Amino acid sequence: EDIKWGMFLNTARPPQFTERRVLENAKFYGQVAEEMGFESAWMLEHHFTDYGLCGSPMVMASYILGATRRIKVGTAINILPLEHPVRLAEQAALLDQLSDGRFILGIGRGFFDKDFTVFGVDIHDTRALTHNYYDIMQEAWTKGVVGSDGPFLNFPPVPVNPRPYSDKMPMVCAAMSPSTIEWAAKNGLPMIMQHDIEHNEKASNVELYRALAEEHGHDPDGIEHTIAMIVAVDPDRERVREECRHYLNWFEDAVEKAQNIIDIVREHRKWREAVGDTAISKVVDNLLRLNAIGTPEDAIETIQHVIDVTGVKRVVVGFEAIGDRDRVLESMKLFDEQVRPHIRGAK
């Protein structure tokens, strides 16, 4: 009945913050996470928008690991198609060595068309790409030498240095779909699950995973899945709800824009910004409900519910939605003192 507690270092940039502030804040929360006995801190990858300024989780993670001693640092996630597998293999294995095995490489397919256009990748291959790039990296780590004649890359056998410090490279997998869930289950690969998914959908995902493991001759109980959550905690549920709502309204618009960025840079007002929609509003109310946003007891109920139905071992939390540093720290304090003590695990 002990949850490993994660902490997102967001590099989202609302209009009312500077790049410096957001990045300094991220660095600072990384140190708060160390001080306050978090299991882990977690990095994101994003390109070309203020949805997130960090486009290299490997570099950011490598920094935070340098700047810390105890805490584990993971990526959520590394978009594998965009990277040569042998490059990321070298990267992860070096950081595993440097970090004395405090690093968790997270992997996913990615879902932004801008990303694949710019780096020159075919967005229809991304499934096969990701599986192949995983296979390649895995062999580099486990065997110490890899080549490819496979469908995407041709290159001869070479050794890839260094070898991991860890027996097995610690990893997670973003997996939203059944075919990925099977693949991960097959490859002994823990899931990390986004925060916008319905709780019973998360329950089903884990059950599906547990089934496919057993079917592919693996112990499901020996894998520890991870969940993302927004936590924003305040005595006055109405106060914190409206703070997060402001943030989340921007967040969902920024998401819309990211899927549109290339067209906007080729273009660049009155009747655009006028034409309330309530489509975003629908999503934001959803997010509030799914996530741990309100009083201590609200958060306890919501967090503990998602543990019960899922049985996840780790919860990676993001505090940023409440605003700037004062408000985040107040939130974090409440959480650490009035919420976290009272959470237990599913077994």
Place this chain on the structure above:
Amino acid sequence: DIKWGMFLNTARPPQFTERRVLENAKFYGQVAEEMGFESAWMLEHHFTDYGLCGSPMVMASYILGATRRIKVGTAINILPLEHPVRLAEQAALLDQLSDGRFILGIGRGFFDKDFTVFGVDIHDTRALTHNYYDIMQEAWTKGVVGSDGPFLNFPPVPVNPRPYSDKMPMVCAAMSPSTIEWAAKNGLPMIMQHDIEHNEKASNVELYRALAEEHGHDPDGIEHTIAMIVAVDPDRERVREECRHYLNWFEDAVEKAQNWHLRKWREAVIKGDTAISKVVDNLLRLNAIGTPEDAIETIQHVIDVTGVKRVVVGFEAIGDRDRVLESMKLFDEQVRPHIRGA
């Protein structure tokens, strides 16, 4: 007042483990900070034991986390091998994260195996390096960059974050004149390897200045860098023998990286072992390997004829941590304090 950098090498001689090398390296990173070095420096090597670190950006990123004050440069990022939009993102972030303590070394790379494995034409490498530079620069200065260029084709997109620095601190590996010209033209400091004859680095700097001024840049405002193997010991012939044994392996490994019949192989070991002997004789001559006095003489001469403000030293040749720490202590006390600028 000379700026001292230190190489965190990750070469693995056969008697060493990967773990030991990488743990030494981190540790020397910490020593560099305490003992008032300006900078620490990381290299990029692939598929070879003559350097383990294939990602200078990761290892640079780590060491900047683990230090307060020291600057960390790379020497060098092999540019052709990485998308310029990705490294733009990387360097700008690390500029922000590190608080402008980062220095992005760039180069062309000359190892064929590398370009084979990452699927790059080794013939195209100079143009790529230049093209890729332009793109990164444009990303940093304007904040948006596309390319219907000769190599990459993608629409204009914003690249985040913006650098912390007003200008991204960089250096450029430059062996050949044509590159030296490009460097200068682009107001780009040089970093020179440790196997260049004294006459030549004189020529390189001269040429640089000449081409710099032509292209309307002030050459005095540019701080060039030179790499130097340091190994300092009372006993000239102990330290020399120690570094000879190491460098024998080293330059042998560098050879293998590029890549009746018992008689034809046995005439390859002798022919190889002399070719390697010749390179290693040069290295001992060119570099600061002897008593404190030998070092002082060699270092100061190299400074005199070049006018470099940054000298980057590597200590690893002399052996393991115990011997390196002895060597580093003599350098600090009996060599360093007796070295002047131009």
